[PDB]
Amino acid sequence: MEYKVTPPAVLREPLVTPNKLLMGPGPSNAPQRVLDAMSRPILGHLHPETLKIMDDIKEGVRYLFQTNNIATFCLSASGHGGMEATLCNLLEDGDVILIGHTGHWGDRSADMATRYGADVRVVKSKVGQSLSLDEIRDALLIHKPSVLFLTQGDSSTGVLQGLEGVGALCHQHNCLLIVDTVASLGGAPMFMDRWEIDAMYTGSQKVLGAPPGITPVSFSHRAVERYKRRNTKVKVYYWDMSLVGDYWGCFGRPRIYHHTISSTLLYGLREAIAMACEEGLPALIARHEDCAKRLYRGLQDAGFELYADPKDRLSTVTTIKVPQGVDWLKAAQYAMKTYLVEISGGLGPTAGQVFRIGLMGQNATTERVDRVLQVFQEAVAAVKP
Amino acid sequence: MEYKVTPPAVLREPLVTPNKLLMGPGPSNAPQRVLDAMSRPILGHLHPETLKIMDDIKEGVRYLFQTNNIATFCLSASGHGGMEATLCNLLEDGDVILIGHTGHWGDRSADMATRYGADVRVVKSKVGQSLSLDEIRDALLIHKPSVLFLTQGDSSTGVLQGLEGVGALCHQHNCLLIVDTVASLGGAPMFMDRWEIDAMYTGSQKVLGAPPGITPVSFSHRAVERYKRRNTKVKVYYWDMSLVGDYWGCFGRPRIYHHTISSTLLYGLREAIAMACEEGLPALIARHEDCAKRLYRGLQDAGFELYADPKDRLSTVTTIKVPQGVDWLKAAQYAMKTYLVEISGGLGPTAGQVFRIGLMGQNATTERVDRVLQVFQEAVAAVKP
């Protein structure tokens, strides 16, 4: 009759959430408007007011993506969930996919594609570079894949992948084009429809500054056609484009129960998107690009070496070579302890090789560029001089 | 420079979120303490303060589940993600799973299991009843499965499934037991280890009254052993027990990046779990059971007929037969328009057959029982002759 496990003393303590300047590659600092909204009361997952918020979110993602795709919605999962769903829906066992590897995100997408039963091919960029159009074409011709996967902003290497003409080329060869824009959307140009992109997703917590955990996704008519010609059901009910699309009112069918959406995350995402739409893409993108340029000047004045090829830089995540003799983790710790500012190390192929400074959303301002420049310089100088 | 899609006018309007009394089967009304916590600033997904919150959550779930399992963590997905992940990790192609069907959740689990490539078998409850031990034993003998899946509280039928001795029986037959406790945990006795349950999950938005979208899960040593003997990687990186368990500090390995957890949902869940642990399981379960007893008296005095067998009722979700000549949807609309109180229809097998009144967390009080009884009776009286 005993309860062998007792109520944890730990939970009698107050919840502690220090207010930090998150100048890593994400999450970025939430606008106060988005934090306030997440105190709103919970709504039922199928209540008209919830569906209204979802509808408004769809219009906002269509703007941000520049698409008219009817199959536009959000996944109830973090950014990886976008990668998962896009692969899960558009691959069957033995389908050949080509991954355009420009950093860690090439490794992660290859992993998921293999877990889903695909025949995974990879074309690797030169170090610190994007893939050229020629390199992409050559690999397409060689592999003859049904899917090509590219990461527009690879946050591990700070590399922005060019996309003009690639969807067109894919479509000459019965190939679908999937693009990750988690780190890049709002910090670099994107025109989903104009660039013939078939499936695309972004993150809530990067340029948008919404909470992590809900991810906008869109599928073209060609991608929907692919889904319709599947011989077997997608492996995960949770990601099934038809079923979540129906919940999100995409295909003219009744709304029905698929899962309970997090109305909290809807509130924060909706306000974040409203803010971004009000600023407008041209101003939003320009602000991130201009901030990044200011960062480069300060870093290069101070004698630091940037990792990415200057032609290939992503505004939102700047990779900086760790100077000979500095302990990057100790530098990070110094910055956090003294200032409550986050500076980050690398990821995947750049683990231990770089620092990464994110300039995203609330943090892409001249004041915050200057702050991160100051504390980064101080932290590096502080450690083994 | 050409933006064919324009900033949506809809997002210029205020976000609107009416505060309703959610007396359907979930989500339930959030404590003010949980809503307040969700305005806290976002933290980095690997920051020590974040890992501390996750650690504290693990202690709380171990308490609520009554388990010492090291493989205890939360999934960054809604309740369906618990079912997905538990099936995904514990099934390989051709594995025989037996589903104990006591309502909708038997159909949904059978669905996911077939999607994941399992050889799916079903044993079905008598209408409005739980499965007996003999019925389970007989089915085990016929199918000889490697996993049995049961739903402790099936929210579609309002049925509580008895679990004493079933894990033991499963283990006598080289079978793992998976149990869904989304609707039942906190509203009915549960002792995961004592009852020899191998995998279990709950929902954040039911008894706990946290936001939807993060789901506590736990796996026994036997379950972990099953995982370790797979010859194939789990199909979804996002659900992989080993990888999310490592992010959650479960297996003695370094914490690494798996995905960006949602700060906001952590805070809400942390607070909800803290509150439940402070009340304690004995008082928490008793409160739900007593509130349900009060509701049954009120309903039966008013001449309504309960759907579930008196011996098999789930405290947290009460199924009520829709009287002859009542439009259930119309009655629900009436209650929502006049009082902002939610009463729900049916789900899956009970769709169009029942009303469902949830008594969960903040809404399991004598006052709220009396409120829903008053509005339910008024709403039904309004649409009937």
Distance from CA of B280 to the nearest CA of A (A): 7
Closest CA to A149 of A122, A125, A179, A171: A179
Check CB contact of B196 with chain A, cutoff 8 Å.
no
> If you search the block for the tokens 């997904």, which residue do you land on?
B45
Structure tokens of A246?
């129906």
Distance from C-alpha of B158 to C-alpha of B249, rounded to nearest angstrom: 36
Check CB contact of B92 with chain A, cutoff 8 Å.
no
Pairing of strands A354-358, A317-321: antiparallel
Distance from C-alpha of A275 to C-alpha of A246, rounded to nearest angstrom: 27
Check CB contact of B12 with chain A, cutoff 8 Å.
yes
Residue type, A317: V
Question: Using the 8-state DSSP alphabet, how is residue B15 labeled?
Answer: P
Closest CA to A35 of B35, B11, B259: B35
Pairing of strands B147-151, B153-154: unpaired
Closest CA to A214 of A173, A180, A165, A263: A263
Distance from CA of B143 to the nearest CA of A (A): 24
Tell me whether residues A42 and B77 touch, CB distance under 8 A: no
Taking CA atoms, B83 is separated from B320, B335, B383, in Å, by: 27, 33, 38
Tell me whether residues B40 and A35 touch, CB distance under 8 A: yes
Check CB contact of B115 with chain A, cutoff 8 Å.
yes
Pairing of strands A153-154, A159-160: antiparallel
Asked if residues A43 and A263 have their Cβ atoms less than 8 Å apart, the reply is yes
Taking CA atoms, A208 is separated from A34, A304, B151, in Å, by: 10, 29, 39
Asked if residues A140 and A175 have their Cβ atoms less than 8 Å apart, the reply is yes
Residue type, A205: Q
Closest CA to B63 of B265, B228, B275, B246: B275
Check CB contact of A261 with chain B, cutoff 8 Å.
yes
- Which residues on chain A are in Cβ contact (under 8 Å) with B81? 77, 238
Closest CA to A18 of B76, B48, B268, B261: B48
Buried b (16+ CB within 10 A) or exposed e, A293-315: ebbbebbeeeebebbbbeebbbb
**Residue A144 CA to its chain's centroid (Å):** 27
Distance from C-alpha of A207 to C-alpha of A294, rounded to nearest angstrom: 18
Q: Coil, strand, or helix at residue A253?
A: coil
Closest CA to B211 of A76, A272, A13, A309: A76
User: CB-side exposure of B229: number of CA atoms within 13 Å?
Assistant: 6
CA angle A216, B51, B285 (to 5 degrees): 85
Asked if residues B345 and B329 have their Cβ atoms less than 8 Å apart, the reply is yes
Residue type, A276: A
Structure tokens of B195?
């009852």
Enumerate residues 6+ apart whose C-beta is below 8 A from A120: A97, A99, A110, A113, A114
Distance from C-alpha of A155 to C-alpha of A360, rounded to nearest angstrom: 12
Structure tokens of A95?
């389908």
Q: Given 2.40.50.140, 3.40.640.10, 2.30.38.10, 3.60.20.10, which CATH number is that of A31-279?
A: 3.40.640.10
Q: Coil, strand, or helix at residue A46?
A: coil
Distance from C-alpha of A107 to C-alpha of A122, rounded to nearest angstrom: 9
> If you search the block for the tokens 């078939």, which residue do you land on?
A198
Question: How many residues does this entry show for chain A?
Answer: 385
Q: Which CATH fold topology does A1-30+280-385 show? A: Aspartate Aminotransferase, domain 1 (3.90.1150)
Q: Coil, strand, or helix at residue B286?
A: helix
> If you search the block for the tokens 């297996």, which residue do you land on?
B251
- Which residues on chain A are in Cβ contact (under 8 Å) with B194? 4
Residues of chain B with CATH 3.90.1150.10: 1-30+280-385
Closest CA to B59 of B68, B50, B51: B68
Taking CA atoms, A129 is separated from A94, A123, B7, B68, B256, in Å, by: 30, 13, 33, 49, 26
Question: How many residues does this entry show for chain B?
Answer: 385
Residues of chain A with CATH 3.40.640.10: 31-279
Enumerate residues 6+ apart whose C-beta is below 8 A from A327: A383, A384
Distance from C-alpha of B208 to C-alpha of B226, rounded to nearest angstrom: 30
* Helices (H), ranges, B31-96: 32-37, 48-65, 79-90
Q: Is B78 annotated as a binding residue?
A: yes
Distance from C-alpha of A293 to C-alpha of A311, rounded to nearest angstrom: 13
Asked if residues B208 and B358 have their Cβ atoms less than 8 Å apart, the reply is no
Asked if residues A66 and A299 have their Cβ atoms less than 8 Å apart, the reply is no
Q: Is B155 annotated as a binding residue?
A: yes
Check CB contact of A73 with chain B, cutoff 8 Å.
no
Distance from C-alpha of B369 to C-alpha of A39, rounded to nearest angstrom: 25
Tell me whether residues B236 and A236 touch, CB distance under 8 A: yes
Q: Cis bond leading into A27, ω under 30°?
A: yes
Asked if residues A163 and A179 have their Cβ atoms less than 8 Å apart, the reply is yes
Closest partner residue to A66 (CB to CB) among B5, B24, B59 is B5
Q: Coil, strand, or helix at residue B268?
A: helix
Q: Coil, strand, or helix at residue B375?
A: helix
CA angle B309, B313, B317 (to 5 degrees): 125
Closest partner residue to A15 (CB to CB) among B47, B111, B267 is B267
Taking CA atoms, B12 is separated from A209, A249, B7, B16, B376, in Å, by: 18, 21, 9, 12, 37
Name the residue in chain A with its Cα closest to that of B58.
A8
A vs B, Cβ pairs < 8 A, gives: 293
Distance from C-alpha of B110 to C-alpha of B101, rounded to nearest angstrom: 9
First to last CA, chain A: 62
